[PDB]
Amino acid sequence: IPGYTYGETENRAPFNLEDLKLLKEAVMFTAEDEEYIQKAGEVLEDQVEEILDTWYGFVGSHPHLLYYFTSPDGTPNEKYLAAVRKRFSRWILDTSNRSYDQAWLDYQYEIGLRHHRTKKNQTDNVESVPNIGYRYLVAFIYPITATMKPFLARKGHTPEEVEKMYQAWFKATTLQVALWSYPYVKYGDF
Amino acid sequence: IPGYTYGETENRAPFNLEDLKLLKEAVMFTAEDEEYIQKAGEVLEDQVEEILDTWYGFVGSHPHLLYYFTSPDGTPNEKYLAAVRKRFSRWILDTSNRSYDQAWLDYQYEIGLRHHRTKKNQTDNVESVPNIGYRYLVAFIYPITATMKPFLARKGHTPEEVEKMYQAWFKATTLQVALWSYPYVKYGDF
Ligand code: HEM
Ligand code: HEM
């Protein structure tokens, strides 16, 4: 997967497992969620192409969102979209299947950097907008969860079990966006 | 309510109603959510004392969270806790009842400043930790929604109605924390 460097990044994250422990506590994430996030992964894995179509369909319906994938002429850079899409697809699996350990934290730092002006447009060597306003990274916690919700019911568990996979995904997505804030936030304010 | 200055803030927010419309789109908030957030705060009005108890009970049971309300010697400042609790109580109603317009936006900027080192500890004239690390503001999107969830069902609405009130609360909470990122974010990166 071009551009995908999980576990082999150039930098160690500026946060460690003790930071992660304390943030899991803030998001109410426990060993029970670890179990249900894996089950979410099992439910979602064969539905990935439909998930991506649904996700990028949302992004594409709003010009000020599609904007972050645009060439200077205001049109979508289709090379950029395609390349990112393969890494997003793998992130769905990573969220479900990776241990949230130090290597995981290292890639969380890398993903933040990539949304931020620090590294945006460098992975795919494209000309696009320099920065994704942090306001929308936070905003997107909601649609990520709303996108996944229908797919978690299709395979075909009880409302009680679906709710647990959904709640685990919500906690896991919030935790990640919190980490991704690091390069956006004024030094010492994170 | 001491320190509560809604509609009476010193400054205008660096964001406007056009920003708010674009952020609402990013969190999938529509006229349909206005109706159910209104209903939510009709359901929640009666139960605010129990909600506050549950909420500060979560904060209180994690030393690194209770931390943010502590005096320099490490002990919780009870004056600070009781005063802020009155404004948080009002915020529950404001989220449900206020029209999200320019004056609401203005109070959003104020709330973010109060969590940040810019205005933390001034409203109540207390001496406490200087800054709430932004990682936890994002993290708290989760427990805030989890706390409201049980209370939204207790007035005997249908499961689809409860779900709709919850999803509206989730959208609205996410929208607010995105706006509160303003004083935390590197100038120009928001
Ligand atoms: C909950 C919030 C979000 C999640 C879970 C998410 C997910 C991801 C993932 C997994 C990648 C690939 C990372 C890699 O390189 O391995 C990525 C990159 C990217 N995302 Fe997001 N994203 C979020 C917020 C946003 C927002 C608000 C936008 C704006 C439309 C956006 C647009 C992009 C763009 C343009 C890239 C390519 C950045 C680059 O040049 O490297 N993302 N995103
Ligand atoms: C979803 C995220 C959060 C929400 C919805 C929220 C809600 C609120 C509200 C409504 C207020 C009072 C605003 C006013 O003055 O009218 C407040 C203040 C405060 N909150 Fe939060 N809060 C969040 C994140 C956090 C976090 C992570 C902490 C860490 C414990 C925290 C602790 C405090 C403190 C210490 C104050 C007083 C700040 C000051 O000195 O003015 N909050 N919060």
Numbering used by the authors:
A (entry chain A), B (entry chain B): 6 to 195
Please quote the authors directly:
Protoglobin (Pgb) is a recently discovered haem-protein with distinct structural and functional features that make it unique within the globin superfamily. The MaPgb* structure can be considered as an expanded version of the 3/3 helical sandwich typical of “classical” globins (i.e. Mb), with an additional N-terminal extension, built by a 20-residue loop, followed by the Z-helix, which precedes the globin-fold conserved A-helix. Residues belonging to the Z-helix contribute to formation of the Pgb homodimer, which is centered on the intermolecular four-helix bundle built by the G- and H-helices of the two subunits. Thus, in Pgb the access of diatomic ligands, such as O2, CO, and NO, to the haem is granted by two orthogonal apolar tunnels that reach the haem distal region from entry sites at the B/G and B/E helix interfaces.
The size and plasticity of the MaPgb*(III) distal site suggest that the protein could bind haem ligands bigger than “classical” diatomic species. Therefore, a triatomic molecule such as azide was tested. The structure of the MaPgb*(III)-azide complex was solved at 1.8 Å resolution (two MaPgb* molecules in the asymmetric unit) and refined to a final R-factor of 18.9% and R-free of 25.6%. The MaPgb*(III)-azide structure is almost superimposable in its backbone to that of MaPgb*(III)-cyanide (rms deviation values calculated for 190 Cα atom pairs ranging between 0.26 and 0.39 Å), and the dimeric quaternary structure is preserved. The linear azide anionic ligand is coordinated to the haem-Fe(III) atom with a coordination bond of 1.97 Å for the A chain, and 1.99 Å for the B chain, and is oriented towards tunnel 2, with the Fe–N1–N3 angles of 125° and 114°, respectively. Contrary to the MaPgb*(III)-cyanide adduct, the haem-Fe(III)-bound azide is stabilized by only one H-bond, provided by the Tyr(61)B10 OH group (2.71 Å for chain A, and 2.72 Å for chain B). The Trp(60)B9 side chain, however, adopts the same orientation in the MaPgb*(III)-cyanide and in the MaPgb*(III)-azide complexes. Thus, the absence of a stabilizing H-bond interaction between azide and the Trp(60)B9 side chain can only be ascribed to the triatomic nature of the ligand, which positions its N3 atom ∼4 Å away from the Nε2 atom of Trp(60)B9. Only Tyr(61)B10 is slightly shifted (about 0.9 Å at the OH group) due to the different size of the bound ligand (azide vs cyanide). Furthermore, similarly to the MaPgb*(III)-cyanide structure, the Cα-backbone at the 150–154 region diverges significantly relative to that of the ligand-free MaPgb*(III) and MaPgb*(II)-O2 structures, with structural heterogeneity at the Thr(150)G12 side chain.
